[PDB]
Each structure stands twice: as structure tokens, then as C-alpha cells.
């Protein structure tokens, strides 16, 4: 109860850094990188009991995940990877690990001032995606 309150809401992308390089490291192909890199998603986060839902809506792709913290689930990512994901809360940060084909990437979401800051890491490459309230 009240675990993720400060995440709940409707958020819009305001800045991005190094996302194309992150996508390259993940294995995303040229055309998907270009179209996906243009997107300005909204991220809609809600909680109902133990179930957290994160929706992403953009002109590129609309996706939605629902999950319970610590409980693995199957996810098809916007770039069409079929991954096994687990999301946990670590010191106030939502930590989302995706595993596929012997690879792994981690997406961290944290509240910083009035922003929701998303850090995506694949090996040595980090992208930072900043969202603000819609
Ligand atoms: C944190 N984050 C994110 O995880 C994705 C999904 C994603 C991950 C890896 C490769 C790709 Cl192509 C897309 C994202 N996209 C949502 C769909 O429209 C394009 C932007 N924006 C983000 O801020």
C-alpha cells in the first residue's frame, strides 16, 4: 500500500540523451531506431492493489505492462524483443531487468524533483530519458 505513489500519473517525455546509442547496443535496427527515436511518449503509471501498470503511448508504438514487484513476466518490447522481465523497488527506484537471448538490460525509474528520470543501461551505454507531468 502506497509503495509507488510518487510514480503514479501521466508523464510526457521532455528530454533524451544517448537513446540512439542505447538502442544500438540493444540490437535495434536502423529504421526502428530512427522512428522510435522521434517519438515523444507519454508514460501512464497506475497502481491497483499489488498490480502496477505502466503504459507507453506514442506515435511509434503503444505498449502496456502490468506486474507485481519481484514476480517475473513475459514482455514484448516496443522494438519487438521477447523478453523475461522482473521489476523491483530498490530504495525508492523502480528497477526493471529484461533478459533475452543471453543478454540483459536494466531500466531504472526514479523521482527527482518534479521529474521522472528513466535511465536505460545496456553494458557500458546509458541513456537518460526525462519525463515531466502531463
Ligand atoms: C524508457 N523508454 C523505453 O523503455 C522505451 C521503449 C524502448 C526500449 C528499447 C528500444 C525501443 Cl525502440 C523502445 C521508449 N520508447 C517507447 C516507444 O516509443 C519509442 C520510445 N521510450 C522510453 O523512454
UniProtKB/Swiss-Prot annotation:
Residues where Phosphoserine is found: 15
Keyword Membrane attached: no
Coiled coil: none
Chief place where the protein resides: cytoplasm
CDD domains in the record: FABP4
Subcellular location: Cytoplasm; Nucleus
GO cellular component terms, semicolon-separated: cytoplasm; cytosol; extracellular exosome; lipid droplet; nucleus
UniProt record, GO biological process: brown fat cell differentiation; cellular response to lithium ion; cellular response to tumor necrosis factor; cholesterol homeostasis; fatty acid transport; long-chain fatty acid transport; negative regulation of DNA-templated transcription; positive regulation of cold-induced thermogenesis
Claim: Lyase is one of the keywords in the record: no
GO molecular function: fatty acid binding; hormone receptor binding; long-chain fatty acid binding; long-chain fatty acid transmembrane transporter activity
Alphabetically ordered keywords of this record: Acetylation, Cytoplasm, Lipid-binding, Nucleus, Phosphoprotein, Transport
N-acetylcysteine sites (modified residues): 4
Motif (Nuclear localization signal): 24-34
Ligand binding (a fatty acid): 129-131
Residues recorded as bearing Phosphotyrosine in the entry: 22
Assembly and interaction partners: Monomer. Homodimer. Interacts with PPARG.
Family, per entry: Belongs to the calycin superfamily. Fatty-acid binding protein (FABP) family.
Function: Lipid transport protein in adipocytes. Binds both long chain fatty acids and retinoic acid. Delivers long-chain fatty acids and retinoic acid to their cognate receptors in the nucleus.
PANTHER family for this protein: FATTY ACID BINDING PROTEIN (PTHR11955)
Entry text on domains: Forms a beta-barrel structure that accommodates hydrophobic ligands in its interior.
UniProt name for this protein: Fatty acid-binding protein, adipocyte
Provenance organism: Homo sapiens
Biological classification of the source: Eukaryota, Metazoa, Chordata, Craniata, Vertebrata
Gene name per UniProt: FABP4
Amino acid at each position: 500500500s502506497h509503495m509507488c505513489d510518487a510514480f503514479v500519473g501521466t508523464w510526457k517525455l521532455v528530454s533524451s540523451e544517448n537513446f540512439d546509442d542505447y538502442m544500438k547496443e540493444v540490437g535495434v535496427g536502423f529504421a526502428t531506431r530512427k522512428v522510435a527515436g522521434m517519438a515523444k511518449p507519454n508514460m501512464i503509471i497506475s497502481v491497483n492493489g499489488d498490480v502496477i501498470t505502466i503504459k507507453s503511448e506514442s506515435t511509434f508504438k503503444n505498449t502496456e505492462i502490468s506486474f507485481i514487484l519481484g514476480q517475473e513476466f513475459d514482455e514484448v518490447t516496443a522494438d519487438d524483443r521477447k523478453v523475461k522481465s522482473t521489476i523491483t523497488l530498490d530504495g525508492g527506484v523502480l528497477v526493471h531487468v529484461q533478459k533475452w537471448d543471453g543478454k540483459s538490460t536494466t531500466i531504472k525509474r526514479k523521482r527527482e524533483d518534479d521529474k521522472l528520470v528513466v535511465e536505460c543501461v545496456m553494458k557500458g551505454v546509458t541513456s537518460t530519458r526525462v519525463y515531466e507531468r502531463a
